[model samples]
Target chain A: CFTPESTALLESGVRKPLGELSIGDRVLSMTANGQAVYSEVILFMDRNLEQMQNFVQLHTDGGAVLTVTPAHLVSVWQPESQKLTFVFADRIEEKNQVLVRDVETGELRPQRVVKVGSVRSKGVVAPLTREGTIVVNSVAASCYA
Target chain B: CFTPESTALLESGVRKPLGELSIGDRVLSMTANGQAVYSEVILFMDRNLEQMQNFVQLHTDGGAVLTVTPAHLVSVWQPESQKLTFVFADRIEEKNQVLVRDVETGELRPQRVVKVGSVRSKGVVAPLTREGTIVVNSVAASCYA
Candidate 1:
């Protein structure tokens, strides 16, 4: 789950804040082979600011940014296994690469993380997708923690 | 998830802290018909104290106490529906009743909540069970958010 303002890529190729999304809405998801696909939103899990202390902010070298709870899972590119893996947002550090969907090329690629910080959030919204994953702020992330 | 000290009822009728339980450990869980059963622990999700703010402390009239993240789900008994429902810990209010298994009778019953407060915690640990529900501090709660 992430801050309400964090945006997810919708099926229309437009980014919409996760808080504003509803069940049944289709969002961009990734297949096991790293192919882009659309997945239906199945559930919405939410928590107010008072429920959580701080949110992790990830800044990637590609100019992509993401704000989410420290325990939230984001897709990372594992060089050793040559595969995509899910890691907690807080565990991600500088030099670690995250999967990012290239807007112009419409392809998924790994983008190096440049910085990791913390920020307060008004609330957290996690939309569970049929495929269990969604592209948030252009970064591949798991819909579940 | 809940505070590290919160205990769960194991298959041998022993209560163990959530933080101490291991994967494959069998814990007491409730069924759709309100039967007492044992379920296997499948996953352990943890978050340090710094990752979350305050924990919701639930004090039931039955002398049962529970400490968990606000968004954590607990099983509640709905009189109107005559069924067990899952509600977030924060959403549980005074006078609401939660399911609690009677240690002596080995039967499940509803225990009215008498107080709800907040407290700081060192960490949170949630053990996912095969049944998706576990008895914590004698109260039934959902394993997933």
Candidate 2:
């Protein structure tokens, strides 16, 4: 889940607000091996902010930003495991590495998390993809949690 | 994420509150093909409820109950796809089928959701297992969002 204003990388090689994405739309997703690919959005979900208030903001060294629910999963590079793994957005800390895409080459790379903070938002939207993952604001994230 | 009091099924064939689970402990988790197995807990997380207040309560016909954050993922049987899928807790409705373990046979089966409601809690806890899934109060749930 993410703030309504958060944008996801689309298959068209552009970014679109997550709240506006529809079922069947194509979005950028990564395979288990870290290859960037396009995946079809299979579901769109939203809930009022009446009861859910906490949100996490991640700032990457590559100038990427993602604002999502605390429990939402974000893909990160785990040096210890030498593999990509998902971690709760709130659990992400400064200095941790997250996957980011290269704008020019369209390749995936790791970027250090420069800052981690909190923000309050009015709404939340979750766009699920067939691949179970999506790149939001250039950061790799999991659709299921 | 779940309320502090929400209990998870453990490898020892016992139930332990999510907040009490420790890293490296084994918990009951399901495979992609629905096999029941024990998985090692890899991480434990908690956040104060000062900002995150919304919690969803799901009651199943099998007497299984789960209280979790709106964005948390719960495993469900999708008749449309004839497969098991994950749905956000808030998106689940009455008549939706959730996987529940039979107490007598220890077999996983789909149980119709009897009621869906909301609750207020003071804290939230997340216990992440290696398999990325766990049975909470007998209901299969994903550890990531």
Candidate 3:
């Protein structure tokens, strides 16, 4: 689903929210050859806990109306990814790549960093959140809370 | 300002969005020896770029109404700061007493870790939004979209 931080490239070469998009808009994507495609937007909502998130339905030139989130949205820039063993005392960021063993493939590839909310591992310190000290073990690259 | 990911603690011990919050509601906080406090919500909106974030107005028992967001939101279990630093390479979630350099004092104490949405320093990994990668630089623990 979409969040406020999401962004997309328009035909006019402007970056904007997918929520601001319409039925016929051009967007930058990795799918097309030029990395750009016509966006057929559809607005939809889903719930998390009790609140709802608004996502966009995009119809590509060949593909039908596709359900998507802000994560699908991007700039003209090629997305960056990375890997890691241990995050130094305090050195990490979203979109920065880190290494993790794949459960299925058992391979380590650069995975896109998502939420750090805050963390603690042995000598590592603990993480805090708006609600309090976060206390959940993440599965793969997905957030549990 | 608030994001779709923003949540608040109700008197019932349930987590709900600030949108679901009312003018007179009790929420979890770290005040009064880290106990949950009654929240006098005053919903306010701010328009930036093209999006809007709703900020909660909070009035404490002894303190005046202070503006707050999900990052300041504390869990009944403990308080954690959701504010900055690379939010891990994946989603995870929490808070507790810890040591951190004071911005002005340079002293380490039992400062509650808050949201990194508001943080300092460059080259630091940013937090993620439901949309995708967060772009705006936040000054306070509040979101900037």
Candidate 4:
């Protein structure tokens, strides 16, 4: 909630800088309920240890290490992130991969999914390895597609 | 912050009636400091806990059950509860499983990975069942394009 004088500048900042900034939270903020929710991922991490394959350890972001697995799936979407929006696998078995289309303005890039081997993951409590990397798979198509 | 005239609406008589009509919460809030999430369904009444195949689990306002597995590469695109946007799957395995389409709506859907001829989750403790149900082959297709 900014002053009126800068409403235009504030509104324009919606796309890019929208995240870095906030609308200031209050103490009396409340919450709502009633909805189906996925269970806890902490439990997922705690359990799926053996299935984990490789280790893509990243140290910078609070010493986080991402496990890479062979029993997992891969996505080759030209624009990634959308890769994790709502896909839910029955079992955390093989990372059954998927794809997402890059619906950007110009590029008619159809997302791709690369079903690979191996799966690995660690807990938040685990130290972030010296080198951590977010495997960036841009928007593409699905492997099985 | 109500003026005198508006205070009448703020009065308990007016407020309680409105609150009662609400029946449920006014808002649903959540905060993910990049913490692990839960998506497992509850087995109430000491049910069979097994005999499960597939079903629907939708949120009130429109959201899917996302069992977050925070690994080496955890990054949130949009984290605020109001705008809980997904960034990317930060690890090597299970990276692209989320983008797989529902096939029904051509829209993506959540799938629990099933183990090979086994009901036990190798190690991954999904918010759902511990048994295997890989998202890859979980969905049975009849009319393939």
lDDT of 2 at A69: 88
lDDT of 1 by residue, A25-139 (tens): 8888775455677877756766453455588888888998988788887878877799666678989999999988897987778999999988975677878664557788888
lDDT (Cα, tens digit) per residue for candidate 2, span B80-100: 787887789999999999988
Model 3: interface root-mean-square deviation in Å: 19.3
Better of 1 and 2 by TM-score: 2
Q: What proportion of the real contacts between chains A and B does each prediction keep?
A: 0.00, 0.00, 0.00, 0.00
Each candidate: what lDDT?
0.77, 0.79, 0.28, 0.20
Please compute DockQ, using alpha carbons, for every candidate against the native two-chain complex.
0.04, 0.08, 0.01, 0.03
Off by over 4 Å in 4: A1-67, A71-97, A101-136, A139-145, B1-126, B129-145
Instruction: After the best TM-score superposition of candidate 1, give how far the Cα of residue A142 lies from its true spot, in angstroms.
Output: 13
| C-alpha RMSD over true interface residues, each candidate | 9.5, 5.0, 19.3, 14.1
Model 3 sits at a Cα RMSD from the real structure of 20.0
The digit string of per-residue lDDT tens for model 3 on B81-135 reads 4322322211212232222223364222234334222221111111222211111
User: Could you tell which candidate, 1 or 4, scores higher by DockQ?
Assistant: 1
Where does model 4 sit among the CAPRI classes? Answer: incorrect
A1-145: candidate 3 lDDT, tens digit per residue: 3332334444475756534544344443221111112232211222232334433333222221222233322211123422112222124444544333333653322345544332111111111122211101111111101
For each candidate, give the TM-score of chain B: 0.91, 0.92, 0.32, 0.17
Error of 3 at B124 (Å): 24
Top lDDT hit: 2
Q: Model 4 over residues B9-112: C-alpha lDDT tens digits?
A: 11121212111122121211112222111111211111222333222211111222222223211122221242222322223132222222243453333333
